């Protein structure tokens, strides 16, 4: 959206 990390479905959001 605006908004999110914009990563692909198999990614685990990073630190």
């Amino acid at each position: 959206e605006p908004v999110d990390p914009k990563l692909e479905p198999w990614k685990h959001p990073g630190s």
Partner: antibody, heavy 117, light 113 residues
Framework: EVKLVESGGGLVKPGGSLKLSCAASGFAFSSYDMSWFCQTPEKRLEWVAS????????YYPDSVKGRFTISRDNARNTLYLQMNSLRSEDTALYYC??????????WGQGTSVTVSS | DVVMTQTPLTLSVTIGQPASISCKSGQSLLYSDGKTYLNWLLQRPGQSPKRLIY???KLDSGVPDRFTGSGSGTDFTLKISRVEAEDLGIYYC?????????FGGGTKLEIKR
């Protein structure tokens, strides 16, 4: 300007090792996942490895899993690919790329690897 | 593992004319979150790949909007409304929905003369 500059390619024997790097500049390196891709002599493109912005998560397809290691130095804006147990099939032009916008946005210039005895 | 198939393999086009490239995946690229991670890129001879399209039809801001992407499911199309001489190169589609990322084999666009 996003800029990615790979180096370290060359001729290597089957079974041997090589370490590639990618010098990133023009952006906040630490914020982005990064990836390696390669282009074969037949102009096939293939995904090689990806690493999370922070460093903790690494992802590899079966073809390289167990042989290559992707790692990154957030302090020096540098991405690496440690290639072990090279195979003739690994012969390719290797590109560093930035993961963003639901995929990949910028590619580097490539560094060439030939695996041959 | 997701098979990506592009058609045609080569496409010969006159400058000013439209062109259309197709990309078909072996299974659906729509993910549960309602997004479809289907991408297009161009590699000009002797150059690095350049992003053209992401999430099916979102346009890279360096690319003129004579390029459009459309489709859903397993069927995708890149269209060029009017070809220019600098479009010469190999167009690839690729998917990031299913691990591992996979590429179509490329469509070579050549300029008619």
């Amino acid at each position: 300007e996003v800029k990615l500059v790979e180096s370290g390619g060359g001729l290597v024997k089957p079974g041997g090792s090589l370490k590639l790097s990618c010098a990133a500049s023009g952006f906040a390196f630490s914020s982005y996942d990064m990836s390696w891709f390669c282009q074969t002599p037949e102009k096939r493109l293939e995904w090689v490895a990806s690493i999370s912005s922070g460093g903790s998560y690494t992802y590899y397809p079966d073809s390289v899993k167990g042989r290559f290691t992707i790692s990154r130095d957030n302090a020096r804006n540098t991405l690496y690919l440690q290639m072990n147990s090279l195979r003739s099939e690994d012969t390719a032009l290797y590109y560093c790329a930035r993961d963003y916008d639901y995929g990949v946005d910028y590619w580097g210039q490539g560094t060439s690897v030939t695996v041959s005895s | 593992d997701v098979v990506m198939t592009q058609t045609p393999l080569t496409l010969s086009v006159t400058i000013g004319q439209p062109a259309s490239i197709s990309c078909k995946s072996g299974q659906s690229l729509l993910y549960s979150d309602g997004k479809t991670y289907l991408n297009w890129l161009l590699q000009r001879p002797g150059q690095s790949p350049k992003r053209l399209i992401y999430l099916v039809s979102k346009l890279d801001s360096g690319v003129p909007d004579r390029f459009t992407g459309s489709g859903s499911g397993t069927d995708f199309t890149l269209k060029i409304s009017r070809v220019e001489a600098e479009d010469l190169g190999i167009y690839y589609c690729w998917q990031g929905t299913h691990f591992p990322r996979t590429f179509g084999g490329g469509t070579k666009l050549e300029i008619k003369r």
